[PDB]
Structure 1
């Protein structure tokens, strides 16, 4: 069972049970059409780096929502475990209440489709996916277990993709809103380089 997640192709469809606002809801990748989606996997509820990533994104949710972007998290844990984890205080490595959905992937189908499943561990690695508003996969970020991701970098990439989507210029190494872009032409490119 190989990864179906290929950049510049539709992101692999998924659906399953998620904990949303303390309740079980059916959630589908297509529920997010028309918005950008940061879709990210994390290894395991009641672990270490994992809660910090969920909380980091959750507490900065408006920086995504103010740019038409949603955030969904997923692990192979069941929805009952997700809820228990939510009802655990941050002070003991719980999430506490949380505004981002927690998708459950007990069958591992979603993790396999995204190519983030670890056959030897029975869970996911640190895999984040940026999916545009048309449902096209744009960016893949995969981290080995011990190192957490970055909300700032994720943010920069969403903003870059939204900008190239809109203007049809391209973003140089390190681009942040306000930085110089490049006209992708053998001639038009000289505006950027010459100066």
Structure 2
């Protein structure tokens, strides 16, 4: 059952990620101090263009300049993530990417987030906005066919940051 609740500490996670083409151990707690956009995508190497992970990567500075990091996660292995990264974009690969790719091979992370699909063995499109004190502020769940918008995510982040500081004015 899902552990993700708005207003509660986002469920702890840790696992191996690909970070600049190397295997690094990564933990939710590594992000304390900053806002974190933590999103799940269904699988590496499919025949859909990975335009949403690419979008977040390409516009990463828009998050980093407002104290926000981005982490992406699927149930693939770190070895698969690596291979997808080292596959040229023009070839359906992801190409180089500046956002970590977290592996959830055991499926524990996805279950903890309520994004796992029992019958498919992968996640749906799930996005989580977690604040600098590690509290969960926002949950977005999309049925598989529909992607997330970087612009919408940015709006939400800036809005949580505004109201953390100033309250709701009006």
The reply to whether TM is greater than 0.5 is yes
Relative to 1, partners in 2 of residues 1:48 and 1:131: Cα closer, same or farther, differing over 3 Å? farther
Structure 2 residue aligned with 1:144: 143
Contact 1:85–1:94 (CA<8 Å) still a contact in 2? yes
Q: What's the CA shift for 1:169?
A: 1.8
Shift of 1:166: 0.7
Q: What is the RMSD computed on CA atoms of the aligned residues?
A: 1.1
| Residues 53-87 of structure 1 deviation map (CA, whole Å, 9 limit, x = unaligned) | 11000000000000000000000000000000001
Q: Runs ≥4 in structure 1, deviation > 3 angstroms?
A: none
Q: Superposition pairs for residues 47-58 of structure 1, below 5 Å?
A: 47-49=46-48, 51-58=50-57
CA deviations on 1:65-122 (whole Å, 9 max, x unpaired) are 0000000000000000000000111112211110000000000000000000000000
Contact 2:49 2:92 in 1 (8 A): no
Q: How far does residue 50 in structure 1 lie from its aligned partner after superposition?
A: 6.7
3-state SS in 1 of match to 2:50: helix
Distance 2:134 2:48 in 1: 28
Is the CA contact (8 Å cut-off) linking 1:46 and 1:93 kept in structure 2? yes
Superposed displacement of residue 47, structure 1: 1.8
C-alpha displacement of 1:131: 0.2
Is 1:49–1:146's contact at 8 Å kept on the other side of the alignment? no
Judged with a 3 Å threshold, the aligned counterparts in structure 2 of structure 1 residues 146 and 48 are, in CA distance, closer, same or farther, namely: farther
The answer on whether the counterparts of 1:49 and 1:147 sit within 8 Å (CA) in structure 2 is: no
Deviation digits for residues 137-159 of structure 1, max 9, x if unmatched?
Answer: 00000000111110000000000
SS at 1:71 equivalent:
strand
Instruction: Report the more deviating stretch, 107-116 or 162-171.
Output: 162-171
Please report how far the alpha carbon of residue 170 of structure 1 lies from its aligned counterpart in structure 2 after TM superposition.
5.3
Flag the structure with larger Rg.
1
Deviations 1:10-61 (A, max 9, x none): 0000000000000000000000001000000000001245721110000000
Render the CA deviation track for 1:121-144: whole Å, top value 9, x for unaligned. 000000000000000000000000
> How many residues are treated as equivalent by the alignment?
170
Q: Runs of 5+ in structure 2 lacking a partner?
A: none
Contact 1:40/1:127 (<8 A) preserved: yes
Cα distance in 2 for residues equivalent to 1:93 and 1:70: 25
Higher RCO (C-alpha under 8 Å, 6+ residues apart): 2
Change (3 A) 1:12 1:50: farther
